[PDB]
Design a protein around this ligand. Structure first.
Ligand SMILES: [Mg+2]
Ligand SMILES: [Mg+2]
Ligand SMILES: [Mg+2]
Ligand SMILES: [Mg+2]
Ligand SMILES: [Mg+2]
Ligand SMILES: [Mg+2]
Ligand SMILES: [Mg+2]
Ligand SMILES: [Mg+2]
Ligand SMILES: [Mg+2]
Ligand SMILES: [Mg+2]
Ligand SMILES: [Mg+2]
Ligand SMILES: [Mg+2]
Ligand SMILES: [Mg+2]
Ligand SMILES: [Mg+2]
Ligand SMILES: [Mg+2]
Ligand SMILES: [Mg+2]
Ligand SMILES: [Mg+2]
Lengths: 180, 171, 136, 63
RNA sequence: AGGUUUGGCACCUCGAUGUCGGCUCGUCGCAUCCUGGGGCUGAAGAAGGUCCCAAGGGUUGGGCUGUUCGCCCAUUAAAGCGG
RNA sequence: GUUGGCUUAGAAGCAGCCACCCUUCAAAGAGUGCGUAAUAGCUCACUGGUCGAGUGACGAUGCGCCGAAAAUGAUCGGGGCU
């Protein structure tokens, strides 16, 4: 959301809560120091599903989308957080989670709705309007039904990143046994 | 905790050092209270402030007031507990100020009451402990309760007034 | 559990968890805090433990798995060679590595089903949720 | 209730596992004949508040 | 956890630290066999079960075996476990 | 509705596997624990009232607590130390 100081000096960071980071449009990149507290209060609200505005000290506001984040093992808190930029209406493919709305009548049949893959990369066009979620109706499918990637609704001409036939949601059959 | 203290018109409290005493119609009862704590009469009704918000403090706040409160109701209305004997042919008598109890025990068991306390047995199986001090009266009637603790089966023994007891029913 | 044909032997060393993620294959997952070996059993009992507390449902995922063979005294002493081919199989796990993951069960549902499997495990553990999303 | 349903619908037992192995359903007629003794019983406002009231159960029984 | 088992190891001892079992003499630990105080019980009473506190004292004579052990006879409040 | 259906000597919120919708309503789960051979019987979930200002739940960390029994007489070297 906001940051003030962003030096090369490493030990000024953890004295407060701040994450060593960067941002780039390829036209330029530069030092970053970001408050950790309001960041994971922020990223929590956003992720890669959408961009948020940046205000650096010195009166420079450049809108950016979160790209990749390097997490510390043995802990929760992140140690890195890469950032990328926005050029309308081209910009880089955005990862979209699969939210599975409605209760299937095959889960009523003793099965379990399971999403094989989430955060589909897709792309395009506006990164004002980005697909922060993906709605998929499962009431149709019952048991053994594999919903593929060509069945997923993506308005405004967002081309599928992966294969059309790749399986996203598949409802898994009830637990079965026969022999002793 | 609860700050207000209702003080009757016949009681006197002088708070100096670690000595806080109440004198009234039922006689004097003197219970020592904390010095580090602030206790004094504000107007008519009593007020006990506490020095800090610290954890070890506030612990003696909720303590102190009811201790003084007990002293208030102690020198005013006094205190009494009702005891009940249950089980076959249990009984109690009175010799001097002393309670004579006989319950299911080869050699009968008796109790000499400490001063300030007085026994009353208006009915053969009904025992009343009378007294000022709310502490001593407690251990007095807890001593009487010692003699036979009501069993998990038929509930035979000494109990409090109408206190209800669950039963095991083995056979 | 114990696997098919191999190289057959090993020594030992310890770093930090490399290929364990934070999350995968479900909502909730289990993460080891201490460097250690886990055997063919343990995790085998951990599966059975977790599944027992479920509907038996096939929603459980085990990212861990025994590879490393360990050995033992045939009877005693130092007489002779190194020996003990089948004693047990172990799977080394390092801190931050995610061990098990579950699917479709609720919050307390998998909280208690991890807790039961918390015991039977030589190390302390903590379960989790997803923030970092990494698939590539 | 279903003693007045199973018999009239021609069912021996009922739904053991209603979600998986299905039993059957029935015509809307079964709402009226069970509504005669349920007037003082079923708590409702007057007139037609008892229409959708009497049988919701067959739907939840598995029949 | 302990350090009584079989071991591992090879550290003092091969110009010598006598090895099993018994008998005699004791003493110590408590993870208590009895006795003393307790909680729970699928504890009605009686008789028990399990856990807790407790080391003051006590803990039988015999048959077979070199045996320790163990099995048996007749007892006992009990016929404790180790150092 | 009501003892929801299945099963059992019966199982009616609560042996138990399947499910967990509807009616009334300021509101009450085919239901959490106790209970019975089975319903009853007693509190919770939730609503209304009475009273006052906070109160409840997960993790992180500093320093502590229990877990903590072995053999001649004990102890941090000792005295002693908040
Ligand atoms: Mg190493
Ligand atoms: Mg990798
Ligand atoms: Mg040895
Ligand atoms: Mg050597
Ligand atoms: Mg010599
Ligand atoms: Mg010599
Ligand atoms: Mg002891
Ligand atoms: Mg005893
Ligand atoms: Mg109990
Ligand atoms: Mg007895
Ligand atoms: Mg024991
Ligand atoms: Mg001895
Ligand atoms: Mg029952
Ligand atoms: Mg059973
Ligand atoms: Mg259920
Ligand atoms: Mg009832
Ligand atoms: Mg009430």
């Amino acid at each position: 959301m906001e940051l003030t100081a962003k030096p090369r000096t490493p030990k000024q960071k953890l004295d407060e809560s701040m994450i060593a980071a960067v941002a780039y449009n390829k036209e330029n990149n530069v030092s970053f120091a970001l408050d950790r507290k309001a960041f994971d209060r922020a990223f929590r609200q956003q992720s890669t599903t959408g961009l948020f505005d940046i205000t650096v000290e010195g009166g420079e506001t450049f809108p950016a989308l979160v790209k990749a984040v390097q997490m510390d093992k043995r802990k929760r808190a992140p140690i890195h957080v890469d950032f990328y930029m926005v050029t309308y209406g081209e910009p880089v493919e955005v990862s979209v989670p699969v939210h599975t709305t409605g209760r299937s009548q095959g889960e009523v049949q003793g099965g379990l709705v399971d999403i094989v893959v989430h955060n589909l990369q897709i792309v395009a066009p506006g990164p004002r309007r980005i697909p922060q979620e993906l709605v998929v109706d499962v009431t149709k499918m019952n048991i053994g039904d594999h919903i593929t990637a060509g069945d997923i609704k993506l308005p405004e001409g967002c081309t599928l990143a992966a294969d059309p036939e790749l399986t996203v949601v598949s409802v898994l059959p009830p637990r079965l046994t026969a022999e002793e | 905790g609860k700050q207000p203290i209702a003080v009757p018109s016949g009681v006197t409290v002088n708070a100096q050092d670690g000595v806080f005493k109440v004198k009234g119609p039922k006689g004097e009862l003197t219970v020592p209270y904390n010095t580090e704590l602030t206790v004094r009469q504000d107007g008519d009704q009593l007020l006990v402030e506490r020095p800090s918000d610290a954890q070890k403090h506030r612990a003696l706040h909720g303590l102190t007031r009811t201790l003084v409160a007990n002293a208030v109701k102690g020198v005013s209305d006094g205190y009494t507990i009702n005891l009940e004997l249950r089980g076959v042919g249990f009984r109690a008598k009175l010799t001097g100020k002393a309670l004579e109890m006989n319950i299911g025990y080869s050699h009968p068991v008796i109790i000499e009451p400490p001063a300030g306390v007085t026994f009353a047995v208006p009915e053969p199986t009904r025992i009343d402990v009378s007294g000022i001090d709310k502490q001593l009266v407690g251990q007095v009637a807890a001593n009487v309760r010692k003699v036979r603790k009501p069993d998990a089966y038929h509930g035979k023994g000494v109990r409090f007034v109408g206190e209800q007891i669950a039963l095991k029913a083995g056979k | 559990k114990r696997t098919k044909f191999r190289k057959q032997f090993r020594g030992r060393m310890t770093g930090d968890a490399k290929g364990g993620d934070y999350v995968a294959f479900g909502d909730y997952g289990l993460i080891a805090m201490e460097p250690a070996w886990i055997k063919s059993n343990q995790i085998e009992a951990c599966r059975i433990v977790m599944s027992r507390h479920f509907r038996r449902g096939g929603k459980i995922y085990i990212r861990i798995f025994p590879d490393k063979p360990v050995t033992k005294k045939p009877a005693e002493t130092r007489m002779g060679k190194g020996k003990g081919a089948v004693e047990y199989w172990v799977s080394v796990v390092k801190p931050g590595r995610v061990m098990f993951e579950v699917a479709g069960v609720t919050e307390e549902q998998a909280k208690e089903a991890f807790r039961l499997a918390g015991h039977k495990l030589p190390i302390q553990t903590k379960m989790v949720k997803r923030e970092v999303y990494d698939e590539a | 209730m279903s003693y007045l349903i199973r018999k009239a619908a021609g069912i021996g037992k009922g739904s053991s596992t209603p979600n998986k192995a299905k039993v059957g359903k029935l015509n809307w007629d079964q709402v009226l004949e069970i509504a005669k003794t349920k007037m003082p019983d079923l708590n409702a406002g007057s007139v037609e508040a008892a229409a959708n009231t009497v049988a919701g159960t067959a739907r939840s029984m598995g029949v």
